[PDB]
Amino acid sequence: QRGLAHLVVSNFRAEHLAGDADTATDAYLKVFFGGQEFRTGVVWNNNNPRWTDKMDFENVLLSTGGPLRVQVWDADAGADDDLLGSCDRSPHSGFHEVTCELNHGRVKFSYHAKCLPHLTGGTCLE
Ligand SMILES: [Ca+2]
Ligand SMILES: [Ca+2]
Ligand SMILES: [Ca+2]
């Protein structure tokens, strides 16, 4: 098997978000890779939130396991929550910092994709 890596996504924070009409944003993130979904907790009333989450996607395929997707949401009453923006990146081996510009503000995070032993290259194919 080729294209395998250990993917870890962390250092989540966002700036100048706009999620409510009368108060500050109540943001949370949904992060997706290879059929797995992780959701952070909510940071109430803060347009510049930071989260302590470290998401370990275990052994994944950087070649074909779809993009790494980060959705920025604002918490309201659940079913009526606001989707503030979404970002897609095709992860590559090594350490990488990501900045996704949204309609208002931006979301930032880092990821480290380490090829599994015997594998090398941008997508661990070699
Ligand atoms: Ca809202
Ligand atoms: Ca609010
Ligand atoms: Ca809200």
From Swiss-Prot:
Mod. after translation: N-glycosylated. The glycosylation sites are facing the interior of the pore.
Protein residues bound to Ca(2+) 3: D20, D26, D74, A75, D76
Compartments (UniProt record): Cytolytic granule; Secreted; Cell membrane; Endosome lumen
Binding site for Ca(2+) 4: D76, D80, D82
Origin: domain of life: Eukaryota
Domain C2: 1-104
Residues where Ca(2+) 2 binds: D20, T23, A24, D26, N45, E58
Tissue: Detected in cytotoxic T-lymphocytes and natural killer cells.
Effect of disrupting the coding gene: Mice are viable and fertile, but die of virus infections that are normally efficiently dealt with by the immune system. They cannot eliminate lymphocytic choriomeningitis virus, but die of the infection. Young mice are abnormally susceptible to mouse hepatitis virus. Cytolytic activity towards tumor cells and transplants is also severely reduced.
Subunit structure of this chain's protein: Monomer, as soluble protein. Homooligomer; homooligomerizes to form a pore-forming ring.
Domain free text: Perforin consists of three domains: (1) the MACPF domain, which includes the central machinery of pore formation, (2) the EGF-like domain, which forms a 'shelf-like' assembly connecting the MACPF and C2 domains, and (3) the C2 domain, which mediates calcium-dependent binding to lipid membranes.
Protein name in the entry: Perforin-1
Organism of provenance: Mus musculus (Mouse)
Encoding gene (name): Prf1
Residue numbers of the full-length protein present here: 410 to 535 of 554
